[PDB]
């Protein structure tokens, strides 16, 4: 398919890791509108302290999805964990096989471009 | 001191209109996600500019705070704080009966860098009280 | 339950290293009152010099009880280890099964809610 | 305050100048490698310049940041600062009646050290106006 | 040397009054998790402000430190710092008889931050002496 | 031909595994003009933050070819790498039998020689 | 001796490392008094600069004792390892069955609590 | 912009006399140790300072900076710079014309303390121009 | 030249009186735990402060350095800065005859933060002399 | 030969890694004149911006001479590998058997030891 | 003499390891004078640059040799490497079973003590 | 040019003292363990004070440095410097001839807190002269 020799192998690794670790995300909103996919999720857990004490511990998601599926996701869009949904902040480069969707939770605010 | 009912003086004032806001008071904050864009107040200097000798006429700032999650566009800072802030606390009577003068000082904006997961405004008074 | 074949596997992780190691505390006050929850409680050291020497050596306890119980758990309640009593202050997002819990003691400091 | 309705319309004004480049009003930005060199506006500043007791006549400062890829010379960016923005701006009604004076302060350029991603632009103006 | 003898007469000023906060003087300090809300008080400056050729009449800085725990609120803090230890120092014969004059500067706050340990708030006076 | 007896092996070791890993790039421009080349291509990601805060979003491709073809190509010369096309900013040293290629993205920032 | 399947391992290690490790230590003042305890000491070197060059190198001797003995100790007690005599600066929390002793060297420095 | 031309003007005198080295134009520059010691020049500042109610009368300064290999001795810096720039700027017509005032403010080294792959002497005037 | 007579003759004057401390001279130091609480005198400043035409009439800054163990409380550092050096050091028949004026500068604490490898005191005393 | 038992070993160790590795280069000028001596070349490469971008990227070469063939050395004398001719800058001192011969590129700059 | 089993077991492994590596050297004067004593020195190379650039490449000797002979050094001592000379400038506090001995060259700067 | 015969006039004054120490020019330096204490002059500032329009009168400053063994006392360094260079620096008549005026303004120490394998001491003198 792709003059690698690897590549082949990084994508069925991918495709294993998908199906073995990992949940069914569903978008909503956006150019892929509703869609279903299977993905990694983490929440690694930030802390800023800002002044005096301002302590607004949160959490930053990552998604680690596949770019084929997720090709023109754009950033305005919003997504769902399940239950939970959260808006694509922003979409890492593909390193060979898939890319990471890093979120935010609530709203997108506003657009502000023009 | 007064700034103790200072604080819940000024507090009041600012609940009196619509709210949409935490409103915590003092230093401690701490947030999370449940109490999203909010309002805290808290004091600063209190030295002693004497400037007569017949009272203490000590002085200090007030610096009350607007925090927004993550990256929302300055448009909306600025929204908050002329109509949730700047106009109802413009005319406070039981603040001018703890006080001697209130003036405007400083606003300016910021927002974390590393994930950015806060973005404030805030406005700073001069205050000028006796202790 | 798990629809990752493998939560399954990290809840029987968990569950065992809560059963094999640390200890049983019980909850006091907060919305579930009288309620006993096991844990592993750890302690490390935490040291400032404020000034030029102020040292006010102390300690930074942590539990890392699982989810589901946790819940509802807010942080101005208290919570006693054996003997001792302590009180949550900050607790941790879910890492698939568990979230650590960190513990200040005596006393929470006033509420200023509003 | 009027800072969004003052960016709102020196932005227009800004558009009504020929495109281009994107015209990202206020600060969050957030580019990627689809909307390459454009522009973003905000305010900084407000502080409380009295100078009389008849009303505010508060001051600030607007800041203009042209975004440029990586390691143009600039002498590009000379010429977007002479092509775009500083003659254009030279005289609009709209700032003229909503502010009171603006004043020219400074003009520089500093481009990313690590990686050499971008090149900004910035011109820092500073406006008097009442609220 | 009076900063022995002006520690000593602040301190049993201070703890004339209602005790439940440790008095340790001086320097070093150290609270452990058994020393909580205290105060302690030292020196600094000591320069050559002779202003009058009959003696040094040197002058340095007092500085009274509270120390409470965490993330304790603001307003307990001024609660407290105003209950205990502002009117104490309002007249002392022995402040009068030890030094020259004695005047306040300013009120300040700080906290720890990593780990938020412990919660600091500062009395700096300006004491003239000739010792 | 190299009086190491080690150059000859990592030369080979090299020629392997940009066999085995690599893709083809098709340089443009330049002495060489349109020719053909096998470069194991990765693109690293990087973020800056200008200003109080501005999220411009890049990575850093690089190719890790061989020295031999890579000789006389300068730094205004483009490259495109199957339908993507980028432009050599700086090649590295030769560790040996190869070297790593910095590119950009787009047309190279004029060229403000004199 | 307690819910943990761990503990007494641990300290069943302790035991034997102490007994395997570390030297006796008669304490002097305190409750103690005149008592033998068994740590594992260790003296490491620490170097200040100061102003230009005021090097003042010197030791951070621990001596790291089970936790349960070191009861009752508080900081303005000294003690006496052999033919060389300390005094404890710092104690830390049990681990879980042990804990460290901080020392500094010669006679404890005055009081000055009040 | 008149900067563009300024610079191509003043790097079009210096190459009046004989090269030696190369001539890159404003900030990218990307030395390497192919264009062995170069010379470049660039501006900043670029302020709006009036001084004359008729116009801007912006001024800015003008940055020369000569790059040598590592560490080569000062006193060759000396030489070069007292014989490639500062005698052939010392008075040009086309560059006296095009600006109001010239005066000159500094001249100092640089080099890279750590590797050490460089060494740059710069010379930094003070222009006022009028747009 | 004048500072190893002054060091000399300032030193000598330390040692008049009972011991008690090592007299560690110039500067290196270089301590260990076996020559414990000790005082050390250096010189700094060096300028060239005319004030008549008649001779360079020279200044410096003596700084006297004392080290004592570790956080030892501030009393026996008070009562050794004012009782074991200050009041030897006020007259010095020597330095009087080596040294045109004679004026205090200064006296400060500080304590090692890192550690606490020792607690150090400095009076700073501001020279003029003539070479 | 030295009262060592190891560092005869690592004598032969780096004696037969030179033989099977780097390659050898002829010295210019100097007391040592002509002369060609074995060693491990390589070349790292190292970066400055200066200002914002000044990129003045440039390598550092490295040889790890013995010390019983390479003594003397000084740093005017020029020193050629391969078909290139670099300049000797710094000398490391002797491990035991060899220590690393630092290179500049050209000619040294001048003398300026008056 | 050694109460620990763990004391006389490092003691030997110094003693062999001494002997294995390092070789021997001789005392110049102090309480020792005339003394050999077999130890392991090295030669750290350490570089600084003062000024614009001042760089005065040199080495941090050591010796790392038995604590209980080198006793009553003091830090005026000096000694010579065989050929080469040193002194003494500073003694680590023994690990346990030896201590470190480092070194600057030639004749130690004055004495400036009293 | 005027700081090349500068530096080789003073050069020259230190050599027809008695010798013992390199005399290295220029910036690099470059010691290692073999060229110890050893003397070290350059030049810095140049700068364009004007004092008249007739002559431009730059202005510059003289670095002189040395570097002794280290930890080595203080007393060597004053000793050396107030017996080797600023007696010598007294009166030159080449320097005086080539210069306007020389002034002097400093002397201060330093030495490698880490490694620790040198202490330099150093003289600055202030020169006006005239290209």
Redesign the interface.
């Known amino acids: 398919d792709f003059d690698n020799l690897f590549d082949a192998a990084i994508a069925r690794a991918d495709e294993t890791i998908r199906g073995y670790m990992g949940t069914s995300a569903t978008i909503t909103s956006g150019e892929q509108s509703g869609a279903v996919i299977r993905g990694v999720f983490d929440d690694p857990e930030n802390i800023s302290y800002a002044g005096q004490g301002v302590r607004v511990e949160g959490s930053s998601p990552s998604l680690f999805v596949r770019t084929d599926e997720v090709r023109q996701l754009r950033r305005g869009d919003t997504l769902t964990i399940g239950e939970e949904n959260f808006w694509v902040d922003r979409v890492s480069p593909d390193d060979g096989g898939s890319c990471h969707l890093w979120l935010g939770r609530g709203v997108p605010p506003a657009v502000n471009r023009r | ?1 007064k ?2 009912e200072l ?1 819940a003086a000024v ?1 009041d004032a600012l ?1 009196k209109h619509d709210t949409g806001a ?12 449940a109490d ?1 864009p909010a309002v805290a107040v ?7 500019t004497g400037e007569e000798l017949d009272s ?1 006429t000590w002085q200090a700032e007030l610096h009350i ?1 607007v ?1 927004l ?8 800072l ?2 908050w ?2 109509s949730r802030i ?1 106009p109802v606390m413009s005319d406070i009577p039981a603040l001018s009966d703890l006080i001697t003068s209130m ?16 973005s ?1 405004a805030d406005l700073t008074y001069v205050i000028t009280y006796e ?1």
Request: hydrophobic residues 35%; aromatic residues 18%.
């Open positions: 001191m700034h103790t604080r507090l609940e935490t409103f915590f008071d003092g230093r401690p904050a701490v947030f999370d996600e999203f808290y004091l600063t200097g209190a030295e002693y203490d705070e925090f999650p993550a990256q929302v566009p300055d448009s909306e600025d929204a704080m002329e700047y003036v405007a000082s400083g606003y300016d904006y910021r927002r974390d860098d590393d994930a950015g997961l806060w404030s202790m």
